[PDB]
Design a protein around this ligand. Structure first.
Ligand SMILES: *C(=O)[C@H](Cc1ccccc1)NC(=O)CCCCCN
Ligand SMILES: [Cl-]
Ligand SMILES: [Cl-]
Ligand SMILES: [Cl-]
Ligand SMILES: [K+]
Ligand SMILES: [Mg+2]
Ligand SMILES: [Mg+2]
Ligand SMILES: [Mg+2]
Ligand SMILES: [Mg+2]
Ligand SMILES: [Mg+2]
Ligand SMILES: [Mg+2]
Ligand SMILES: [Mg+2]
Ligand SMILES: [Mg+2]
Ligand SMILES: [Mg+2]
Ligand SMILES: [Mg+2]
Ligand SMILES: [Mg+2]
Ligand SMILES: [Mg+2]
Ligand SMILES: [Mg+2]
Ligand SMILES: [Mg+2]
Ligand SMILES: [Mg+2]
Ligand SMILES: [Mg+2]
Ligand SMILES: [Mg+2]
Ligand SMILES: [Mg+2]
Ligand SMILES: [Mg+2]
Ligand SMILES: [Mg+2]
Ligand SMILES: [Mg+2]
Ligand SMILES: [Mg+2]
Ligand SMILES: [Mg+2]
Ligand SMILES: [Mg+2]
Ligand SMILES: [Mg+2]
Ligand SMILES: [Mg+2]
Ligand SMILES: [Mg+2]
Ligand SMILES: [Mg+2]
Ligand SMILES: [Mg+2]
Ligand SMILES: [Mg+2]
Ligand SMILES: [Mg+2]
Ligand SMILES: [Mg+2]
Ligand SMILES: [Mg+2]
Ligand SMILES: [Mg+2]
Ligand SMILES: [Mg+2]
Ligand SMILES: [Mg+2]
Ligand SMILES: [Mg+2]
Ligand SMILES: [Mg+2]
Ligand SMILES: [Mg+2]
Ligand SMILES: [Mg+2]
Ligand SMILES: [Mg+2]
Ligand SMILES: [Mg+2]
Ligand SMILES: [Mg+2]
Ligand SMILES: [Mg+2]
Ligand SMILES: [Mg+2]
Ligand SMILES: [Mg+2]
Ligand SMILES: [Mg+2]
Ligand code: NA
Ligand code: NA
Ligand code: NA
Ligand code: NA
Ligand code: NA
Ligand code: NA
Ligand code: NA
Ligand code: NA
Ligand code: NA
Ligand code: NA
Ligand code: NA
Ligand code: NA
Ligand code: NA
Ligand code: NA
Ligand code: NA
Ligand code: NA
Ligand code: NA
Ligand code: NA
Ligand code: NA
Ligand code: NA
Ligand code: NA
Lengths: 56, 237, 73
RNA sequence: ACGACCGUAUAGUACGAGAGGAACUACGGUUGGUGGCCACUGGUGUACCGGUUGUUCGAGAGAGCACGUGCCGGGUAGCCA
RNA sequence: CGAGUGGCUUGCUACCUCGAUGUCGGUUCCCUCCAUCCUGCCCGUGCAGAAGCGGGCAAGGGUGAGGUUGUUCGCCUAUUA
RNA sequence: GUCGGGUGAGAACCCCGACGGCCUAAUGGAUAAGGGUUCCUCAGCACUGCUGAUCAGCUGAGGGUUAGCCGGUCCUAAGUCAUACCGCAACUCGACUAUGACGAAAUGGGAAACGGGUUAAUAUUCCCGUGCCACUAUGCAGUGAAAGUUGACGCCCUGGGGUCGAUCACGCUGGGCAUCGCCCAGUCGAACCGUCCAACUCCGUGGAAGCCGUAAUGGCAGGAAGCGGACGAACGGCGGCAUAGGGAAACGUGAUUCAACCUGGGGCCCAUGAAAAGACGAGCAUAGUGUCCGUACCGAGAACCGACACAGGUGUCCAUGGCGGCGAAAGCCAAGGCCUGUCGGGAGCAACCAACGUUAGGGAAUUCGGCAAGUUAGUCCCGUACCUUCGGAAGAAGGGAUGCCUGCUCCGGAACGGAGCAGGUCGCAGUGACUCGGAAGCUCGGACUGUCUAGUAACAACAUAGGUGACCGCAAAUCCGCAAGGACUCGUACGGUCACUGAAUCCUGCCCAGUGCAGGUAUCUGAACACCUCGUACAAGAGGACGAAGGACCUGUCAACGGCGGGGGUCUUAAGGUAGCGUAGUACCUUGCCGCAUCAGUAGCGGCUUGCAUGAAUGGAUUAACCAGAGCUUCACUGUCCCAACGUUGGGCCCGGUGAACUGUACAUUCCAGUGCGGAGUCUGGAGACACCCAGGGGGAAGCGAAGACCCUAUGGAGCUUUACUGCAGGCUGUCGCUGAGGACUCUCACUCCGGGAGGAGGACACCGAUAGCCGGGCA
RNA sequence: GUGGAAGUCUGUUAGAGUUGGUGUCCUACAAUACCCUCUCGUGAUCUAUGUGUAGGGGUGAAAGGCCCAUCGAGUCCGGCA
């Protein structure tokens, strides 16, 4: 079975959804954790220094 | 390379775990204040998914209902007793001290009150040889002579289900069904059939181990494969 | 017996399956009553269809060579 | 756009102790190639005609479908070897 | 032993192509060369004849079917001018 | 699809009718996920729609989803999270232990709803009618009340009860057909309330010594049959519901086979087939309450995922519509759906191409190879070799039969079930289409079913049972973690971990020198602390004594890595190839030699065999069965071939509409020769050459496509290996701290483990922290 | 005779798989498709949903296979010009 087009057919599972905390469609309803703001994992907001160029 | 199979095991993932949730009871000797008065009645004989051997359901005088590591010859209705003054019949449990030397025993405690550790598999049995006020010498199924505190409780008789090993599985399918009831990864791929990256025996234009198979006791996990600290190998001599 | 296996598995494997299972299915003499109405209920479990007595025995035989040594000692 | 071979007469002759055994020429045919043609034989021929299985149109009659003819039997013209 | 011709084999060289000129064999279809296997015309013969052997001119046409092998090559069979 | 017609400025494709078709586990009906308004109405055509459009899933504007009794909600599953505890330099990190919570919408468990009607669009939700559940309140009853039952369960075989459906018989109602008298549709009616009860179990009676009983097993003096009784089922029967409802009408009765549903019996396990909430137990009247969330529509060759209205992918239920037949098979046909797998018009419609039919005579000559195609085919009777693990081989092979019509027989309660008989009779052909094996032999491999390179490898590779060796008594062996801790383990040697070989059968020789592992070890070697000497008012430093693991040394071990020769009638380096097998899937010489087979056989098979360079669990030999595995032979078959032809359908060609891409330094009508960085349309010399266009098959542009994947080069990269260099985890061992009392010893008080506790075991060791030596491609 | 076992047989039942055609396609219907052929089809079976394991780590009946068209070390951003 091709890993391409034919394997795209079974994709009717919902995972990422609109987050209650940040509003981004990044709340993983299976994990109950937002990949965008960290809701469900961290009280503090998810943020990293690598989201921008080192000197900026 | 990559961690070998023996290393994936330890992590305790689903594939390597025993279907505990599908198991019945943790077979252990009952706790008795003292006196021995404790006796109960066999109510039923069930199959133990964890040992592929029968086990007996018992109702005790003080209302307690617990499964028990059943020796051969226990039937519904029989009355079992557990304590210092328990009669000396099959199925009854009492300290090695109170047991007459020369009698076959099973489910022996390593230390008084641990609920039994030795001789619990199908048809096996320990052999109480010597007594004393300090040491009770028992011979375990492996043939070893073990010195035990005479206060160590045990059950009279041999474990039920003897001879299980006598019949061959005949087909992969039967192994399969048995394996599905144990904490084990099956089937087994030989190291020599793997890639160098996956196992110290892997690789090569043909199949053979790289070095000798006898590995030192000091070898680290990932390398300790083959014949571990073998005192010898083969059959000759 | 082993005939369900067809020409598969070889001599020893199926000869032992027949041997074990023939003894296995033999009429067995009940320990409580004395009637030969003991049948295997499952692995290591036996019962008398006559009185209903359910016993603990060998895996393919109600009595094992070792279980007998117990009675004596 | 023709190449080549076999056979007959020549002749059981010339030659030759014998065994054996030609030619010129004239004929008949075959093979390969070439161009064309379909009276003849042969192929096709889901034009056509018949037989018959299953099913549907109530039966009958007459029909549809079964892969672009259900299958079987016959086959004109044309196209072909 | 000496003198050469060819550019099919094999080797040498590293000029051409590494921002790629698709491999061997086979097949199919076309043209060509002659150092001619057959056919035409000839010379010599240790040329009686018949059957050959060797040579000259000559490239018009022909040079086919099969068994083993991927084979090219080659070995083998029966036909063949 | 076609002919008519409707609407419209405009109609091949929007709508109506007829005629003609397509889909039958789906192209029908209901839905899960997922989509998200795509649903309905009106108005439109700039966009989207493979052409057009008056149409639309498009554009714009409105409208549309109604629940005590359908879901959610509640319960608990694998498992997840939160808090506490502990770890960590630390956390948004981390295992355990407690507590709490979360975790099932088709498809786990579960209090209660049916029938009719209605809208453009909802409907067990609204309306009408009827019914039901739970809680609460009032009243009567009741003292019972929590033990127990239920929820609640695997795989295989099977009996009984039984509804719908389907069919048969006959009657009634309506329809169709028009030589008969046939053919089609209907003939209805719920939840619920009440009642009936087969099976199972049990009781009394009875008293079987051979009877009772089953599809089968089975039952019995420990009491069989029979008889009487207790308990006791359906989504089933029966009555109500119902001068409800529905139907134009009639508004039936019996039967068979019986999905659903109910209830039993048997067999299997080295496999044992959830849990909890809840319900029952535990009466009745009347009344009140029953909130919150979901509800439209699609559910797919246009509403989902795949960039698309994508030939792909995507779960559940309808498995009982008719004929057919073994059949949920083919073929044909209903109900229902559709003509939207959405561009059309024209040419006897050429060449060429895709799918395909048929080809005389020959019959594998084709080819690496029978690739492709073909042959055979269903059912019954007869009959069936070698070999074999006795199962099989086997549908071996081979031979015969097969329709229709008339009248019958047998099995059975019967079938619209099955098996036969006699007679008549048609065709070239009776499994008449359809469905539907070609057969046989030799050799190689793996025993077998199974697994695999999603996307060029399905195999001989992996797995497997079976054989074997290794480690470990559980405070274990093995393994994960930095730690706190953890898997194995609800486990305990008949265990489970680590490896090798790979069913069966006959077997499995010799070698311990090297390497590995393990045991032992007088002596030798062997670090640090402490100790002794020298040195320093101290210190650095030098040296000594003692000496752990380890090494030297000795021993054991090959189903441990591996080895099994040259020479002579021993030497390297331990042994010197045994049983077997052998030109091998291993044999260079090689197409070895002989034989079989053929006209001819680098093939195949058999024998020989000095084996370049076979050989025993790096398993050897051999082997029935099995195989989309490799090679060979025969019969059969045939367009694979001789050698091609004709035909069918879709293209191709012409016309209307729609409308890309690849590629392009320039110039360019070339050809033959030459030359040139040695492979030129463009240079040189000649030759040829009027321009433009249509179709073709692809000779050339070293054609297009891809900064060559081969090869080398770079003090490039990565993955892998090891007795490469250097280090790092980990294991072993000595020492110091925890740490205490009296080269060997006792004790108990820290500390560890067992025990519910009392207490028991162990004990200054172990664990843990620090350090030293050895091992250390496990890792960088 | 009864019984009805089997990693048993036939089988496009459903469903799973993917041998040959080296066919069609190869600016595709499709970044793995179509057709015929073929294998399995009561079991080590197939399948939906839920759930667990995470990057030198998983998972692997072992092909260096698979971990969202990405695997001899996923993807994203950063180190980084
Ligand atoms: C040897 O001749 C190599 C073989 C090869 C190399 C790489 C991968 C597979 C096999 N063949 C070539 O180098 C052919 C090159 C083709 C060049 C065409 N322009
Ligand atoms: Cl096991
Ligand atoms: Cl719902
Ligand atoms: Cl029954
Ligand atoms: K090149
Ligand atoms: Mg992928
Ligand atoms: Mg336990
Ligand atoms: Mg078995
Ligand atoms: Mg498991
Ligand atoms: Mg294995
Ligand atoms: Mg490999
Ligand atoms: Mg390695
Ligand atoms: Mg091997
Ligand atoms: Mg090996
Ligand atoms: Mg037709
Ligand atoms: Mg080219
Ligand atoms: Mg000449
Ligand atoms: Mg010429
Ligand atoms: Mg609409
Ligand atoms: Mg409109
Ligand atoms: Mg919940
Ligand atoms: Mg449910
Ligand atoms: Mg609707
Ligand atoms: Mg709806
Ligand atoms: Mg469409
Ligand atoms: Mg022919
Ligand atoms: Mg041939
Ligand atoms: Mg040939
Ligand atoms: Mg074929
Ligand atoms: Mg009868
Ligand atoms: Mg036929
Ligand atoms: Mg061979
Ligand atoms: Mg195999
Ligand atoms: Mg592949
Ligand atoms: Mg295969
Ligand atoms: Mg393949
Ligand atoms: Mg193998
Ligand atoms: Mg074993
Ligand atoms: Mg094994
Ligand atoms: Mg084993
Ligand atoms: Mg030979
Ligand atoms: Mg050996
Ligand atoms: Mg010029
Ligand atoms: Mg390059
Ligand atoms: Mg290379
Ligand atoms: Mg490197
Ligand atoms: Mg503890
Ligand atoms: Mg390295
Ligand atoms: Mg099978
Ligand atoms: Mg099958
Ligand atoms: Mg899953
Ligand atoms: Mg490899
Ligand atoms: Na190896
Ligand atoms: Na020359
Ligand atoms: Na180039
Ligand atoms: Na070629
Ligand atoms: Na010539
Ligand atoms: Na040849
Ligand atoms: Na009823
Ligand atoms: Na039928
Ligand atoms: Na259209
Ligand atoms: Na199978
Ligand atoms: Na050795
Ligand atoms: Na050694
Ligand atoms: Na060898
Ligand atoms: Na197979
Ligand atoms: Na043909
Ligand atoms: Na060209
Ligand atoms: Na690499
Ligand atoms: Na029998
Ligand atoms: Na296929
Ligand atoms: Na990585
Ligand atoms: Na970067």
């Amino acid at each position: 079975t091709g890993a391409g087009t034919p394997s795209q057919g079974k994709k009717n599972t919902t995972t990422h959804t609109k987050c209650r905390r940040c509003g981004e469609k990044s709340y993983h309803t299976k994990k109950k954790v937002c990949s965008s703001c960290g809701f469900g994992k961290s009280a503090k907001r998810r943020d990293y220094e690598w989201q921008s160029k080192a000197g900026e | 390379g990559r961690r070998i199979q023996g290393q994936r095991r330890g992590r305790g993932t689903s594939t390597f775990r025993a279907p505990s949730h599908r198991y019945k009871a943790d077979l252990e000797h009952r706790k008795v204040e003292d006196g021995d008065v404790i006796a109960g009645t066999v109510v039923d004989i069930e199959h133990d998914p964890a040992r592929s051997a029968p086990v007996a359901a018992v109702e005790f005088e003080d209302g307690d209902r617990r499964l028990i590591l059943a020796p051969e010859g226990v039937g519904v209705g029989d009355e079992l007793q557990v304590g210092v003054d328990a009669e000396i019949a099959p199925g009854n449990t009492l300290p090695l001290a109170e047991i007459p030397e020369g009698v076959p025993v099973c489910n022996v405690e390593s230390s008084p009150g641990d609920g039994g550790k030795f001789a619990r598999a199908s048809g096996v049995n320990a052999q109480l040889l010597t007594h004393d006020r300090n040491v009770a010498v028992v011979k375990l199924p492996s043939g070893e002579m073990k010195r035990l505190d005479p206060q160590c409780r045990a059950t009279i008789g041999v474990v039920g289900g003897g001879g299980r090993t006598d019949k061959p599985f005949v087909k992969a399918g039967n192994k399969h069904h048995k394996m599905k009831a144990r904490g084990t990864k099956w089937p087994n791929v030989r190291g020599v059939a793997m890639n160098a990256v996956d196992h110290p025996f892997g690789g090569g234009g043909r199949q053979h181990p790289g070095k000798p198979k006898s590995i030192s006791r000091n070898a680290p996990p990932g390398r300790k494969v083959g014949d571990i600290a073998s005192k010898r190998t083969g059959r000759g001599g | 017996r082993t005939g369900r296996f067809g020409p598969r598995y070889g001599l020893k494997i199926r000869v032992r399956v027949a041997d074990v299972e023939i003894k296995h299915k033999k009429k067995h003499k009940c320990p409580v009553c004395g009637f030969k109405k003991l049948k295997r209920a499952g692995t290591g479990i036996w019962m008398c269809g006559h009185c209903g007595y359910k016993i603990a025995g060998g895996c393919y035989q109600p009595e094992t060579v070792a279980g007998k040594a117990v009675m004596k000692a």
